[PDB]
Design a protein around this ligand. Structure first.
Ligand code: HDD
Ligand code: HDD
Lengths: 726, 726
């Protein structure tokens, strides 16, 4: 036996906080969590304990340490079938990554609606508040490869597979409410532009290069989503703290055949929260798997990601009531004009067992709809419907990708389709066609109906010539970017300016930067001037005189577009670094941890080495990480208790830890002699908002810190940070 | 026309320093760089200027902006073949990445021997110093995906495809002289252990995780390459500044049929140089494409990567003369015992045109040898021979991957093989079998001979039973790690310690850390105690009393194992950050740029914003990047000219710039009022070795600076950096 005697190789099969236990496969970690999809994957789950090592043919292997050779220093023999099976399988492990959104992290969960929506849709998964629908959700970036970093600036994908009783419904969204382009025909162009440039394949995971800004400068329709991407929306703190949107207008179809237009929304119940750019960038180097890790660990801890499904609903007769086209995917529907009606709740409560088998192989496709939904003519949606079926033929090896376990419906599926690579189902039907008499025409078509009926498209009127033409109604590019800008707080505006300025600095051809600044002058002259200035560009007289675009249906702002305008902080599942010394004051530590535990906030105990330290009273404190190994990038706040402060006062790493957290606007709390650390970050004797300080770590020292954490970052600190060399 | 009037979209077709011009495909950048292989690709290069946009079938496209739809707001029509072709090709762009070494960067060049080697090898490419062999070289990391970061801690791959007159020879090596494991049967185990863990696919590009150290702790044969990976060898400054090795003993065979044992080496003519860990890790976040960028830009600048090919030659009668087995790929041959004969030089002088077509699709395989070379019984080599043919069947789509342009021989190739997916050659031979009379038996076998002859294996004697058994002569695991350890400088020793300490700190299961510490105590107690101390572990008495392993054939060190013991700095191609201010002392800048130019050292002008600044004498200085956009991580030294130092004196980014560079041991030079920056980095009034300072930037100031740059980093500074919060 290689396992240790004390059984410490095996993670506890119960919820534990991040870092307490090694992470494990979801069905070993949380064996008691179940839903109908997880249950149905049981036939393909393979265990391992107490089984013999075999070939794939079931032959027991005696020596898995050597090749077969003629003499123990001799040549390897071709007859070594155990070696060749094992190397062959290794040699063919990889499958193509997704063309876009290659980088992504996934979890199982469930959805339930709040009430029946049968008055507006016959969709079965929305028919009954008791009806629970298993889900599999994959979150992702867009641009980078599967091995790229999580906390890049990019759009995020938020893809949900609902395993309904009437088929698979995939809701394939992003974390911003619009897309960059209007017609699918341009997708390979846009994607080629944002992707690594084709001569040298640089840069990975970054829009900060010439071809992307070239495209944008020439295609003003992209400016709306670019504004989002340049805002702090482009750097979420967690997949748990971002919004999701279906982007397109789709249709709900009720049992009377009435169509209602709908846009889909996901509201994060843990609230909205983003990083700051310098933090996000550095974090791609300190922990390129930060969001993937954070997601897995939240679930293992029982901080399950929760989201609320919502619908913006527009009657058919209201199609033309707005200043923009409902079918234009570069246009959002302001919540001030059409509120989001709450629909149901989704909880992600189980990690996969095998990342490749469940996550890498999952195929999501927005054409996968169910009776009670239908499409519209949104010409970007329209082209999507072709792609997500097509791409699976190479990515997943052929037309039986629905038989890969994670993709299988849990409801019945029967039809006359046969064969194809790696065909699993063995059909016993004497007929493989219809109509047939030799099996009495089974499986049979089902008329549409109120429930359990066949799919019928809504009979929308089509009238016009066969044209490759953009609708004139789509030809307005600035008003939405402007509404977005005006809806942001002043610090969010600063961050947008600085996103454009940093990205444009990396564009080598100066005329591209100028053409982008010219485009910004059409959206807002304040934004345009602030960017221009950071680039050494002066606006012309002409540019200074560009009339701003009209407001959107009378709105001069919509605060639902801002991350922070309306506080919606949740501290549960956030993390605090506690910087230890070799003689910690235990009364400080007890108080800190007790207050954190009460609010569901985790802690990591840091020191200059691993092992343990002993507190003043003899208490042994296990160290999670070093200052350098778990940098401030990875936590939401930092607390330093009293003790032997001299032990760390001249530690570069410990000082720097505070400077980095200070710069990135995080709450910092210092107790007793840990107040000495005020010098390092240049805090006045009388203190400042965002630095909590006191003789000892209570009375209200933890309440104040916890209040700063609910506000996420100390925005008021922003003018103070250019000073600090961090 | 969309290009700018002044033609600044197009980079000059002449060598230019990094950042001076946009980078370009190699045949547009260096159209007159030719070699036989590059010329032979001309049939497949496709241009673009002045051609009409078409489908793949050659049909001109009128509107590449719109799908075809029934009405300009109507549905997309299935008959849109233009859209579907474009989206189909997009949907299938990706191919499986390499199972290992997926991340890599490649260039064209040539090789030429220094003298005829026909005394020891009939290999045609080694027959005449005037024989020029085109080459294609791909450098890589090992663990991470195609999308992961360059400056990770990893082994690096160094693969060279020689397009010889008698066949392709691929020399498929790494940047350390041994591998982790003895027998190819264990390669899937080792690789699964090092790769992201299967439940959650974390971590990317890092050995710093439980499963890797689990394997290492249980397989002491790994310890030798583990030591190299934990040293600064695991973090090269550049693919130009690392060694390459074939690892295995192979054979040269001469025209008389005499076999000589050979190990291959590549010696970098730019010298050996590595980053420090904190810089490397941070650089994976600031520029994950840094090595790829730096290789491409060196070649565009004319800093061609050059390497000397070297052979360690051991006569057949000397097979058993050492105290390790020549066929054990975890053992190196110390150059103190068998010197490296320098045999030729390879120059990398042209970048690819298309990364995907030339780099991603390149197939290298060590079984691709030519008459004059042969294999040995090394059980790791033996197993590789199977893998590199097998893996291309999925990765490159079939058995015709040799017809992919970058992979084609430039010499004749004719045989009876036919068909296979994407067969390009159209065979006219009446026969597809031999022996045949219908084509008079052509193409025909060729007897082996001194030149242009067929391949015959060296008739090595085999005697032994069919066994799966490790040779007992491979059962020694510690003496090579020890020799490597003892051969490092004191500062390289500290970085090895820090390497294990950092990595093991991230292993969650503490017993794994302990088991690894125990292994180190079988190598060297000093090492084992220093790593234990960082982990909060105490060695027992038993561990304190483990006898060290014996010397290697009497050697207690070999300075050729160190990166830095023997000075071999070359500053050509290195880069310095010059930090600007809004009134630069122009006389300082003239002197600096002049001295750098003379040594081939590049410069990047940095400021708080883009655009320009104007010098005291009115010279207009273009800014390359901001302090934040081109961090000190990306440069070899920092110089700060005099001028209006007040302008940057209080800029946090400029201050941090100097702190970061100082912490990573880089030379810093400060002229006139720039010396006010001594305060940010805590430098005593009467100066410190590694900080160049003077009233102005005279001739002596630049010589001192360039002398430091030749020593790569200021190792004496290491005790000062603990103090610095950066
Ligand atoms: C016409 C092509 C096309 C266009 C216009 C879009 N996409 Fe897409 N998308 C794909 C073609 C595609 C794809 C090529 O089919 C992918 C890559 C691999 C795959 O399975 O689907 C994909 C993947 C993909 C994923 C990852 C699903 C997963 O995690 O596996 C998400 C979240 C989206 N897309 C979301 C969007 C949104 C919100 C869009 C605009 C509203 C959008 N896509 C436009
Ligand atoms: C038994 C399997 C096996 C073993 C023991 C090794 N490798 Fe390997 N290697 C592969 C199987 C393989 C592979 C699966 O066939 C790869 C992956 C993709 C490809 O085309 O070849 C590969 C790729 C690969 C590459 C990248 C080539 C390129 O850039 O495309 C390098 C540099 C090496 N290997 C070097 C080594 C060295 C120096 C080894 C030990 C001395 C070694 N490999 C052991």
């Amino acid at each position: 036996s290689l396992a240790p005697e004390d059984g410490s190789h095996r993670p506890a099969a119960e919820p534990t906080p991040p870092g307490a236990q090694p992470t494990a496969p979801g069905s070993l970690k949380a064996p008691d969590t179940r839903n109908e999809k997880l249950n149905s994957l049981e036939d393909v789950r393979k265990g391992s304990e107490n089984y013999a090592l075999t070939t794939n043919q079931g032959v027991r292997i005696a020596d898995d340490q050597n090749s077969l050779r003629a003499g123990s220093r001799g040549p390897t023999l071709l007859e070594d079938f155990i070696l060749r099976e094992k190397i062959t399988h290794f040699d063919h492990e990889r499958i193509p990554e997704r063309i876009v959104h290659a980088r992504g992290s996934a979890a199982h969960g469930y959805f339930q609606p709040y009430k029946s929506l049968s008055d507006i849709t016959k969709a079965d998964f929305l028919s009954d508040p008791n009806k629970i629908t298993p889900v599999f959700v994959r979150f992702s970036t867009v641009q980078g490869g599967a091995g790229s970093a999580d906390t890049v600036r990019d759009i995020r994908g938020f893809a949900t597979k609902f395993y309904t009783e009437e088929g698979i419904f995939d809701l394939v969204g992003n974390n911003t409410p619009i897309f960059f382009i209007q017609d699918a025909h341009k997708f390979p162009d846009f994607v080629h532009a944002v992707k690594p440039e084709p001569h040298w394949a640089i840069p990975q995971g970054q829009n900060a290069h010439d071809t992307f800004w070239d495209y944008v400068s020439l295609q003003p329709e992209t400016l709306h989503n670019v504004m989002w991407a340049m805002s702090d929306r482009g750097i979420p703190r967690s997949y748990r703290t971002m919004e999701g949107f279906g982007i397109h207008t789709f249709r709900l179809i009720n049992a009377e055949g009435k169509a209602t237009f709908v846009r889909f929304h996901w509201k994060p119940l843990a609230g909205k929260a983003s990083l700051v750019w310098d933090e996000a960038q550095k974090l791609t180097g300190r922990d390129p798997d930060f969001h993937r890790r954070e997601l897995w660990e939240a679930i293992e801890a029982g901080d399950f990601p929760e989201y609320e499904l919502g619908f913006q609903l527009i009657p058919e007769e209201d199609e033309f009531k707005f200043d923009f086209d409902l079918l234009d995917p570069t246009k959002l529907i302001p919540e001030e004009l059409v509120p989001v009606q709450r629909v149901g709740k989704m909880v992600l409560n189980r990690n996969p067992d095998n990342f490749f088998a469940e996550n890498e192989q999952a195929a999501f496709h927005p054409g996968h709809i169910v009776p009670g939904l239908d499409f519209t003519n949104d010409p970007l949606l329209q082209g999507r419907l072709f792609s997500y079926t097509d791409t699976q033929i190479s990515r997943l090896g052929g037309p039986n990708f629905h038989e890969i376990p994670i993709n299988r419906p849990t409801c019945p599926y029967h039809n006359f389709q046969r064969d194809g690579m790696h065909r699993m189902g063995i059909d016993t039907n004497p007929a493989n066609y219809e109509p047939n008499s030799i099996n009495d025409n089974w499986p049979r078509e089902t008329p549409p109906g109120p429930k359990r009926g066949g799919f019928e498209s809504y009979q929308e009127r089509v009238e016009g010539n066969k044209v490759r033409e953009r609708s004139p109604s789509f030809g307005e590019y600035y008003s939405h970017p402007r509404l977005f800008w005006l809806s942001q707080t002043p610090f969010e505006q600063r961050h947008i300016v600085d996103g454009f300025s940093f990205e444009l600095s990396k564009v080598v051809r100066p005329y591209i930067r100028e053409r982008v600044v010219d485009q910004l002058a059409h959206i807002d002259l304040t934004l345009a001037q602030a960017v221009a200035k950071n680039l050494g560009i002066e606006l012309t007289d002409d540019q200074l005189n560009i009339t701003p675009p009209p407001d959107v249906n009378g709105l001069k702002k919509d605060p639902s577009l801002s991350l922070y305008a309306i506080p919606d902080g949740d501290v549960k599942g956030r993390v605090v670094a506690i910087l230890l010394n070799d003689e910690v004051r235990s009364a400080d530590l007890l108080a800190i941890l007790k207050a954190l535990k009460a609010k569901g906030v985790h802690a990591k105990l840091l020191y200059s080495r691993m092992g343990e330290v002993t507190a003043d009273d003899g208490t042994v404190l296990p160290i999670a990480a070093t200052f350098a190994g778990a940098p401030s990038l990875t936590v939401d706040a930092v607390i330093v208790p009293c003790g032997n402060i001299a032990d760390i006062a001249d530690n570069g790493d410990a000082n720097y830890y505070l400077m980095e957290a200070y710069k990135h606007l995080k709450p910092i709390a210092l107790a007793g002699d840990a107040r000495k650390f005020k010098a390092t970050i240049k805090i006045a004797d009388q203190g400042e908002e965002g630095i909590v300080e006191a003789d000892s770590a209570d009375g209200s020292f933890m309440d104040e810190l916890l209040t700063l954490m609910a506000a996420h970052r100390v925005w008021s600190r922003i003018p103070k940070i250019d000073k600090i060399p961090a």
